[PDB]
Amino acid sequence: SCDLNATNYIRGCQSKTYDGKIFPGKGGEKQWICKDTIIHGDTNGACIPPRTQNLCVGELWDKSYGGRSNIKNDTKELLKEKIKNAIHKETELLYEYHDTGTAIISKNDKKGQKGKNDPNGLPKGFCHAVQRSFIDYKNMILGTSVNIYEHIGKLQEDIKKIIEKGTPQQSTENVNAWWKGIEREMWDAVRCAITKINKKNNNSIFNGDECGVSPPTDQSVSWFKEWGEQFCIERLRYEQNIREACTEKKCINSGDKIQGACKRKCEKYKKYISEKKQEWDKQKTKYENKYVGKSASDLLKENYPECISANFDFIFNDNIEYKTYYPYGDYSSICSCE
Incomplete structure (x- = not known):
């Protein structure tokens, strides 16, 4: 049960280029x-x-006209949806980046040759990359990563604010709790995106748990x-x-x-x-x-x-x-x- 036959695409997130185009x-x-x-x-x-x-921060950030937070006024429900969409899209884009052999960690010892698919039929390095991006999202949400982007440090801060005014008071500790309460649904965005690879790939059958x-x-x-x-x-x-x-x-x-x-x-x-x-x-x-x-x-x-x-x-x-x-x-x- 996923929105597998439901085509969704978002601005701000283009094909990956981090190890090259x-x-x-x-x-x-x-x-x-x-x-x-x-x-x-x-x-x-x-x-x-x-x-x-x-x-990919998708609809969390508005890059237009000098860039600004796109989550200043959101409910925690809308924020959750925007995170989920970004995670989903990241997964899709990471698939492409590794399936095409472009990511350094997807590469074979030999030039031009492809890295051997991992053992469930997914491109080499894809799961590692997806896992790492998920950890980056979590740390952005928790406000526990690095303050290197004034705009992502701004995202940690706007998220914190939505959560505080949207949950009963007792707090970055409510932020910890909120994250733990949505974590499974967020991971299901990854699992769903993986499920959608069946539409794309004939190496195996993909259940989303790979x-x-x-x-x-x-x-x-x-x-x-x-x-x-x-x-x-x-x-x-x-x-x-x-x-x-x-x-x-x-x-x-x-x-x-x-x-x-x-x-x-x-x-x-x-x-x-x-x-x-x-x-x-x-x-x-x-x-x-x-x-x-x-x-x-x-x-x-x-x-x-x-x-x-x-x-x-x-x-x-x-x-x-x-x-x-x-x-x-x-x-x-x-x-x-x-």
Whole structure:
């Protein structure tokens, strides 16, 4: 029982672009935004996912003429409907973004090749992305995310106001209660959107429970896990390129030194690692002194099979000898001669 045969579409939410435009479009990708002088929940710093920066807020926000809150005067009933619509649409757009192989986490180790569907017949990464967006909605509603958008910080604040004047007084604690009271219905918007994939897809039959019967499952931890999944997938793609370019044993004389395609693919990864390093240090540090006795490396490796071969301490090692002895990090031996 869903509005499966009921076509609904909303302004403000276009096809995703956070990891780049869908082909034949190109570029337009977002980057991880790490800020120093912000607080995420309780502790200092944060790295905001490209996906979060692309979140569909649908009819909650009016982008026209400089942008304004579209929920200043709403009942909590109308607000709930607008959230549900946004969640539904986000799910639909995330499906497209992953089905087309555009999202980094939907990609295969190989170029042009598709990531293998997960094990219920949905595109690789789709459920993870949908789960992460749901967590972002919850935190926006609770007013417990980040104050990075003056307009989304404004949404946390307008939501809070609707709830207070629309519920019996006893309060952000009423906001917590209201969220818990609608959570199931909000997740049913995801489940419904998934059900509507049957109209679109012949890999399986979709009952709507494939990304979980219940919603998932600390926003900073969710964001870091997302960072990790993306990092580890990208790393394995760097590895394939290196192995394709360097393997073939062609090493031009000087021992011998790496040359041509090999040197170039190897240099790309070294560059990649140097750019990700700052993101890793920031998030690792935040996580490991919030969660005492817990390891950032463990968090990623228990969750994502792509991270298993990643030795994070080696990869992001800031020691003196590593720079000279391992010019291309953990891939220095593939990036060598004989």
